[PDB]
Amino acid sequence: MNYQPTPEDRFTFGLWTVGWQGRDPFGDATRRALDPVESVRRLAELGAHGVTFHDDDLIPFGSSDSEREEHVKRFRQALDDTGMKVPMATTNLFTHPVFKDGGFTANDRDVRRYALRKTIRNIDLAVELGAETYVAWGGREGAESGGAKDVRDALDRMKEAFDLLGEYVTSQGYDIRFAIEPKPNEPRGDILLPTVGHALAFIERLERPELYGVNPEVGHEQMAGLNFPHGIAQALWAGKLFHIDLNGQNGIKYDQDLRFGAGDLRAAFWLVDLLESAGYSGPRHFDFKPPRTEDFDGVWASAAGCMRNYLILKERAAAFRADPEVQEALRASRLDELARPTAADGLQALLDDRSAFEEFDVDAAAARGMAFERLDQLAMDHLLGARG
Amino acid sequence: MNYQPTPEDRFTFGLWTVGWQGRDPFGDATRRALDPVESVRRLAELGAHGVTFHDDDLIPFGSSDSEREEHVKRFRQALDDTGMKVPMATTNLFTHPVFKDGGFTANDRDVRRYALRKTIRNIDLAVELGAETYVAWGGREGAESGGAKDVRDALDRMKEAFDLLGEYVTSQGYDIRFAIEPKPNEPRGDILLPTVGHALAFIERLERPELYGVNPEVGHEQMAGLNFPHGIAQALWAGKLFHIDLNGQNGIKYDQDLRFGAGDLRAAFWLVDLLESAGYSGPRHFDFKPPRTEDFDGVWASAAGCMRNYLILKERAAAFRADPEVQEALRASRLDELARPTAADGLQALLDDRSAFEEFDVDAAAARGMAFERLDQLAMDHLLGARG
Amino acid sequence: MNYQPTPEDRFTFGLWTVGWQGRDPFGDATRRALDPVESVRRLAELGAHGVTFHDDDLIPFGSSDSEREEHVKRFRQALDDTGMKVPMATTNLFTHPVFKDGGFTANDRDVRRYALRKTIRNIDLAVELGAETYVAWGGREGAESGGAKDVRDALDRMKEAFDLLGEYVTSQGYDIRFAIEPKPNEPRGDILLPTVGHALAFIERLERPELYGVNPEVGHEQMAGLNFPHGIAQALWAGKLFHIDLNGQNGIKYDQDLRFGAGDLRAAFWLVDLLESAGYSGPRHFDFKPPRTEDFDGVWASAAGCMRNYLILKERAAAFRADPEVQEALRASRLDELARPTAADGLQALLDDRSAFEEFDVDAAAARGMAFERLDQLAMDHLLGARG
Amino acid sequence: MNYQPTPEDRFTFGLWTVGWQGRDPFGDATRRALDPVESVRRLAELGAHGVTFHDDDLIPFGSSDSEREEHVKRFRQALDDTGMKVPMATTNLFTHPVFKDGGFTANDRDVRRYALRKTIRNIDLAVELGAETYVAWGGREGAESGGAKDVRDALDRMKEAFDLLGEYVTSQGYDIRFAIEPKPNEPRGDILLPTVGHALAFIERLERPELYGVNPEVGHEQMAGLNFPHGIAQALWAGKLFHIDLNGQNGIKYDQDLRFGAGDLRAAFWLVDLLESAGYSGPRHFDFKPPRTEDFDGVWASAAGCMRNYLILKERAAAFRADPEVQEALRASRLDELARPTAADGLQALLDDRSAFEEFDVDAAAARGMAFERLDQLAMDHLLGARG
Ligand SMILES: [Mn+2]
Ligand SMILES: [Mn+2]
Ligand SMILES: [Mn+2]
Ligand SMILES: [Mn+2]
Ligand SMILES: [Mn+2]
Ligand SMILES: [Mn+2]
Ligand SMILES: [Mn+2]
Ligand SMILES: [Mn+2]
């Protein structure tokens, strides 16, 4: 209708998304490896704006300097050939067995130091490629057992690491900012900074908090049964939504990484409504895995579907908010009053206001319906294109 | 052996715990109401240190001033008769139908103002009774549907409310501090500030953050599938564990409020280990419900079991930490190294250290086992009293 | 468009749905009680086909015979006035404190006998009102602790109870059949027969299995994180879908009882697709609760929304299945081949078929993509009305 | 004390347990491959009774006949050298990419036929090695999307497959029986036969149901939030507990496969209590993964811990059941009455018994406490070795 993405829509994809070969813990690869150059070309043809990478997605672990230079050269040529951007990069601190107990919070100090050096090397590369955001997903930070990890000590180590990275970027005069990606579990039994809230709270204890925000992922918050739009709202309220990862998840299970729109469809609607109403200006990044049932045609169909679903939901959310009948229902439900200060008159005036206590008619207020069901059915009708 | 509590152990109980009449949404009351005086006497006989209350537990909603005075007088006499303390109090902003859409974040502004006045009245009472901590559980703050609640606006209202309460306590010269209690859901479909992390993050945006901490509850974090000891560790790391609620929960379901030790027993062990190792000095408060299957004899047995289980776990955790074989296993697993700074030498030294990158033997480090399973089996053996 | 229900659509509602007064465990009632006569009239005006009841919804517990007769007379007049039917009835074996440890599986034998007599009395009433199905939801059958309930003994008692009920209906020559409603938890910590599968398995051990089927509820299976359409498919496969309860649930939490279509919208789509493709001919019954935020206008809006959402989804699922492009995608994904016997040639022929083992080209088969993502995006486009 | 296993305890392990190399979806191997001969020797030294295998654990996929013969010969020599048994075997119908959409319920018919031939070949081997039980875990049977898999058709295919296998074993005169292993999800978004109940129900529709039972796994049922002891009780009630897999899981997340005793410790206690009270005579099989943090010393420690924890729990459960104070508490809680028939007098006598209805004192019965909390605290005290 026809919901066709173009680079102006700012849709981005990780190399590791469309490039996922399909290995799962009970299963071998179902697809051959993709050359990053091919991924860049195919994503551009679909209307993507850019790509993102872990160090080890772009440059095989253990590469020589000559190999590294050539991998980067080929990638840059593909970006130049297509007009694709690289808005974000990140470090792989989870695949190699050296990181089995963590990177920044490994019990082994030598591993912690190595993790920092590996990250710093890739920050330099990210800046060279034009990235504005550097993500950190501490997927190995955590434990399967209680004695293995003293979390206060681990948080001290995690703060030290992020503070050193902030010192580094400041010393180099780089404009790049960090986005910490929470996840509750998987691959560790419990992961440190398990939700958006825990990550937001941790950032406030860093030496230079302004350099750090969050990179929430739809499926990660949903793995804790949380409301992803609500958590995004809190991140926006805090001024900390530096990046976002979009995908689908069906509740509380392993991280499915379904295409965006799959999983909890209504949550996807309310997320798009929020991002668009708030004027979020960052990339709409997809961190998803085309299911291992698919061949490459299915990989590109799944990637296209991520963007299509965002655009359909954008249309429906805008129509919802613009509909005079919805605007009336929002007033009927007192969403306008929610946005007004409780006591701009000040504390003493509130204390002196008999209408707030002695003369408050509690039963009359209690009897007033909220009209939320009518409002929500208008929302459903807009999502489904069942208005009239 | 025999794990007998005394007031020196600082165990406290809400009036609403042992006083729960057994109504659930599919069920009528199974027990008669308890007079608070009787609860104070019976808890003291069990070795409790004190009790806590919502306003409406102590003074029936809608009471006259003469009725209020008499309810408080009788309660104070029972406290004096027994030596019981009142370390914490809180407001009921959830039972009355006026609070069906919230107290502090109700869409209706008049309800928000009333909620604040109801709280302020009870802060005065709490201070009169000697409470150090004032808990706020915003159980009605949230939504069942996406359009009903704009979370950025609701967080603005929530901040306004807590800021006004901080202004109030400061204006009165009170020493009392606030503890915000997160919960992910129930009774609302999703509750605002759903976890310890979200609450910690929110506090940092208040005008006087030093006045506010968290009151985490075992079962609430477990309703999001989170690791309660880990979340307590983050609260301790932040200096924000102002109070704690102890109970049991079996995973992801309705809030069960089982007695402490029930539900996730190993998590209970690691929690006690953490509180005791950290020297937490606040009350060990039980927010639990004796199951509705029980008569009053079972109510008091369940309350006694809360304290007994804490004391057993305290003994076992202390024995674990003191055992030279465990101390050796902790070193074998590099818990000592986790507690050492990563780079006290500083950023430039780390950047110049070839042992951290070019000359780091990644394969040798990767080959070193963590020895976590042996450590955890020593922990299991200590918990079960199966050492030798 | 405009998705208007009429009695021919066979939509039914429990009296306890629209009549829910809004009490939750942390909250008092937000709505006055509804007279069943009023509910019948209001539901008929919305286009409902009928209503269902627990004994105690229609006749207050403890009523005299004269009171009982009058309650039933008034209800029958309302049914006659409106043309509403009563296709299903059930017993309340959960609200009264006598049932705190169960009805049919109470540890107390006298309670088990009473539960059976209470049920039998209401079976007679159900038959008088024309009900074809008698539901049993054993919400109190289960435990909070391991020693409280020996499940083998409880299953013996549960079988005895259902066998006695089958003997009763057979002895009276009644045509009514039973539908057992599974639920995993709430109000008990764990409920016996927690899923559709457990209930199906139990039925096979009854003396007269043909008299018993299941009454699955959307939200109950989703409280165990299960796929409700899949479970319905297994019940249909077994010939045991005797009734169904439709509502919404957001994953793993307390039973929300949201209106149908809310909660997991895509699961609602696939459910409707399955019921309609299978030709399920039973009532489309809504077991839901208008949120306690609502006044009566919101109650009726929420009930109307249940039916509206079913009808929208019915339209979209039919359009999906009828679309030649979808029919082609289904063949591309080998749904046709799934429906063909694996080895109609028989075991010996399979054993002798070299194409099934020695000469099977495993790599060629593995390379063939399933094309499931394209199929699922066609399904999404149909659900959202985004085709063209 | 010291909880030392010996072969008489009938503890068994899969080759794939201790042999797990540590690959997870975000991580490469952390341990070298183990020769099955070495695993047999090391497990025997720990006091194991036997081992189990998938075809592809023992014989690399794609092996020639000469290679196959030699792999089996070496394995048999190790079994003979140690006295280890092989009580169970199974087929790998999940790792190879050909099985990406299933084995027995693959949409591709040629894959379904191949899956059956692969299984049949391994049934022959299992019988040669003396296995009594043949497990089937359909880990790839299921879907990520609704259109991909018609579950009624898939259940038809699954029944055909199991019926053909039953025809095969009967035709060969083998004594081996099948055990179907349910799992709710992972690696598929939803797996067919997701719980013990669904598997039990499916078996009743097979042509020769007596040949089939279940192989429940602790962590699988817990991935649906279900009570594993309750599900085992239902399997025992049905006469269908043909095998069992023991491990640990912390609730609703990816399948952790922790050592037995880890995860939900109290559920482990009640499971052991049930198996021992019921006289279950099958192997106590561990399907677990030593965490990838561990070296080989940690692998063997984790395996030893599985057995140790079973033996500790066995001791504590026996002591609980034998304690006269517990026996009294069980009577106080009416567990004796739960085990008595409800109405051995028959239906007519129940209908004629005024004590069951008109003269039943509902309030007196309701007032009687169940005494479950005292019983459960005795259970806790026994588990923790805190009696006296
Ligand atoms: Mn993910
Ligand atoms: Mn991500
Ligand atoms: Mn709670
Ligand atoms: Mn609490
Ligand atoms: Mn329900
Ligand atoms: Mn229902
Ligand atoms: Mn498993
Ligand atoms: Mn298994």
d(CA C112, CA C141): 11
Q: Helices marked H in chain B — which ranges?
A: 15-18, 36-46, 55-58, 65-82, 109-128, 151-172, 196-203, 218-222, 228-238, 265-278, 296-322, 324-332, 335-338, 347-352, 362-367, 372-384
Of A30, A296, A373, the CB nearest to C259: A373
As given in the structure block, the two tokens for residue D339 are 């085990």
Of A2, A253, A266, the CB nearest to C225: A253
Of B144, B168, B334, the CB nearest to A107: B334
Does residue B203 contact residue A119 with C-beta atoms inside 8 Å?
no
Q: At what angle do helices C265-278 and C228-238 cross, to 10 degrees?
A: 20
Q: Which residues pair with A271 in a beta bridge?
A: none
Could you give phi then psi for residue B342, rounded to 5 degrees? -65, -40
Is C217 known as a binding-site position? yes
- Residue D366 burial (C-beta neighbours within 10 Å; 0-12, 13-18, 19+): middle
DSSP C260: B
Does residue D99 contact residue D115 with C-beta atoms inside 8 Å?
yes
Does residue B46 contact residue B40 with C-beta atoms inside 8 Å?
no
d(CA B112, CA B120): 13
Asked whether the beta carbons of residue A200 and residue B205 sit closer than 8 angstroms, the reply is no
Does residue C41 contact residue C51 with C-beta atoms inside 8 Å?
no
Whether residue C187 has a cis bond before it, omega within 30° of 0: yes
As given in the structure block, the two tokens for residue A257 are 């990484």
The pairing of strands A245-246 and A284-286 is parallel
- Distance from C259 to chain A by nearest Cα, in Å? 9
Nearest to A287 by CA among A3, A15, A5, A8: A15
Question: What value, to the nearest 5°, has the Cα angle with vertex C333 and ends C330 and C338?
Answer: 85
Nearest to C141 by CA among D230, B253, D197, D267: D230
Does residue B160 contact residue A160 with C-beta atoms inside 8 Å?
no
Helix (H) or strand (E) holding A332: helix A324-332
Active-site residue list of C: 54, 57
How many residues belong to chain B?
388
d(CA B23, CA B27): 5
d(CA A160, CA A139): 18
d(CA B150, CA A121): 41
Q: Which residues pair with C54 in a beta bridge?
A: C90
The residue type found at C55 is D
Asked whether the beta carbons of residue B252 and residue C253 sit closer than 8 angstroms, the reply is yes
Nearest to C191 by CA among D197, D62, A305: D197
DSSP D83: T
Does residue A261 contact residue A313 with C-beta atoms inside 8 Å?
yes
Q: Give the distance, in angstroms, between the CA of residue A13 and the centroid of all CA atoms in the same chain.
A: 12
Helix (H) or strand (E) holding D13: strand D11-14
d(CA D56, CA C204): 36
The single residue of D56, D57, D264, D273 carrying the catalytic annotation is D57
Does residue C290 contact residue C248 with C-beta atoms inside 8 Å?
no
Q: Helices marked H in chain D — which ranges?
A: 15-18, 36-46, 55-58, 65-82, 109-128, 151-172, 196-203, 218-222, 228-238, 265-278, 296-322, 324-332, 335-338, 347-352, 362-367, 372-384
DSSP string over D214-267: E--BHHHHHTTT--HHHHHHHHHHHT-B---EE-B--SSSS---BPBTBS-HHH
Does residue D264 contact residue D225 with C-beta atoms inside 8 Å?
no
Does residue A248 contact residue C380 with C-beta atoms inside 8 Å?
no
For the CA atoms of D269, D270, D274, D276, the dihedral, rounded to the nearest 10 degrees, stands at 10
Contact residues, chain A, for D250 at CB < 8 Å: 189-190
Residues 6+ apart with CB under 8 A from B322: none
Does residue D103 contact residue D148 with C-beta atoms inside 8 Å?
no
Residues 6+ apart with CB under 8 A from C331: none
D180 CA from centroid of ligand 5 (Å): 30
Nearest to D70 by CA among D59, D62, D79: D59
Residues 6+ apart with CB under 8 A from D328: none
* Residue B353 three-state SS: coil
**What are the structural domains, with CATH classification, of chain D?**
1-388 (3.20.20.150)
d(CA D302, CA B376): 9
Of B144, B153, B252, the CB nearest to A339: B153
Q: Which residues pair with D53 in a beta bridge?
A: D89
d(CA C109, CA D173): 47
The residue type found at A153 is D
Radius of gyration (C-alpha) of chain B in whole angstroms: 23
Q: Which residues pair with D14 in a beta bridge?
A: D52
- Residue D74 burial (C-beta neighbours within 10 Å; 0-12, 13-18, 19+): middle
B245 CA from centroid of ligand 4 (Å): 5
- Establish whether B198 is a catalytic residue: no
The residue type found at B268 is A
As given in the structure block, the two tokens for residue A287 are 């961190």
Q: Return the number of other C-beta atoms located less than 10 Å from residue B331's C-beta.
A: 12
d(CA A174, CA B240): 34
Asked whether the beta carbons of residue A373 and residue C290 sit closer than 8 angstroms, the reply is yes
Residues 6+ apart with CB under 8 A from A219: A247, A248, A249, A255, A256, A257, A258, A263
Residue of D nearest to C197 (CA): D198
As given in the structure block, the two tokens for residue A107 are 């019990």
Conformational region of residue C35, where left means phi above 0, alpha means psi within -120 to 50, and beta covers everything else: beta
Nearest to C28 by CA among D367, B92, B142, B113: B92
Percentage helix, strand, coil for chain A under 3-state DSSP, each rounded to 5: 50, 10, 40
Binding-site residues from annotation of B for Mg(2+):
181, 217, 220, 245, 255, 257, 287
Question: What value, to the nearest 5°, has the Cα angle with vertex C150 and ends C149 and C152?
Answer: 135
* Residue B246 three-state SS: strand
Whether residue D187 has a cis bond before it, omega within 30° of 0: yes
- Distance from D321 to chain C by nearest Cα, in Å? 10
Binding-site residues from annotation of D for Mg(2+):
181, 217, 220, 245, 255, 257, 287
**Chains with 3 or more CB pairs closer than 8 angstroms to A?**
B, C, D
Asked whether the beta carbons of residue D113 and residue C184 sit closer than 8 angstroms, the reply is no
Q: Which residues pair with D12 in a beta bridge?
A: D50, D285
Could you give phi then psi for residue A261, rounded to 5 degrees? 100, -35
Q: Give the distance, in angstroms, between the CA of residue B48 and the centroid of all CA atoms in the same chain.
A: 17
* Residue B107 three-state SS: coil
DSSP C33: P
Conformational region of residue A10, where left means phi above 0, alpha means psi within -120 to 50, and beta covers everything else: left
* Residue C255 three-state SS: coil
Instruction: Say how many CB pairs under 8 Å bridge B and C.
Output: 99
d(CA D92, CA C95): 49
DSSP D97: G
Q: Return the number of other C-beta atoms located less than 10 Å from residue D265's C-beta.
A: 22
The pairing of strands D190-191 and D142-143 is antiparallel
Place of tokens 């939803």: D190
How many residues belong to chain C?
388
* Residue C13 three-state SS: strand
Place of tokens 């009490």: C23
B289 CA from centroid of ligand 3 (Å): 9
Conformational region of residue A115, where left means phi above 0, alpha means psi within -120 to 50, and beta covers everything else: alpha
DSSP string over B8-19: GG-EEEEHHHHT
Does residue A225 contact residue B252 with C-beta atoms inside 8 Å?
yes
Nearest to C85 by CA among C36, C117, C135, C50: C50
Residues 6+ apart with CB under 8 A from C88: C12, C52, C126, C131, C132, C133, C134, C135, C179, C243, C283, C285
Does residue B383 contact residue D309 with C-beta atoms inside 8 Å?
no
* Residue C382 three-state SS: helix
CA–CA distances in Å: residue B238 to residues B200, B232, B235, C28, D210: 8, 10, 5, 37, 60
The residue type found at A127 is V
DSSP string over B59-85: S-TT--HHHHHHHHHHHHHHHHHHT-B
Whether residue A187 has a cis bond before it, omega within 30° of 0: yes
* Residue D284 three-state SS: strand
Q: Return the number of other C-beta atoms located less than 10 Å from residue C177's C-beta.
A: 16
d(CA B119, CA B134): 10
Does residue B80 contact residue B37 with C-beta atoms inside 8 Å?
no
As given in the structure block, the two tokens for residue A367 are 């009897």
d(CA A129, CA A123): 10
Nearest to B33 by CA among B18, B52, B44, B47: B18
d(CA D92, CA D139): 9
Method used to solve the structure: X-ray
As given in the structure block, the two tokens for residue C366 are 């593995």
- Residue D177 burial (C-beta neighbours within 10 Å; 0-12, 13-18, 19+): middle
As given in the structure block, the two tokens for residue B35 are 């007079």
- Distance from D247 to chain C by nearest Cα, in Å? 19
Ligand nearest to the CA of residue A255, numbered in listed order:
1
Residues 6+ apart with CB under 8 A from C299: C18, C31, C290
d(CA D357, CA D355): 6
Gaps in chain B (C–N > 2.5 Å) come after which residues? none
D186 CA from centroid of ligand 7 (Å): 9
- Residue A9 burial (C-beta neighbours within 10 Å; 0-12, 13-18, 19+): middle
Q: Helices marked H in A173-293 — which ranges?
A: 196-203, 218-222, 228-238, 265-278
d(CA B109, CA B115): 10
d(CA A18, CA A12): 11
Question: What value, to the nearest 5°, has the Cα angle with vertex B38 and ends B37 and B42?
Answer: 120
d(CA B219, CA B201): 20
C133 CA from centroid of ligand 5 (Å): 19
Nearest to A243 by CA among A291, A285, A276, A302: A285
As given in the structure block, the two tokens for residue B191 are 């509750």
DSSP string over C169-184: HHHHT---EEEE---S
Does residue C371 contact residue C329 with C-beta atoms inside 8 Å?
yes
Residues 6+ apart with CB under 8 A from B8: B49
Mutate to test the interface with B, among C253, C258, C292, C299 (most CBs of B within 10 A): C253
Does residue B370 contact residue A102 with C-beta atoms inside 8 Å?
no
Nearest to B281 by CA among B236, B318, B323: B236
CA atoms within 13 A on the CB side of A47: 15
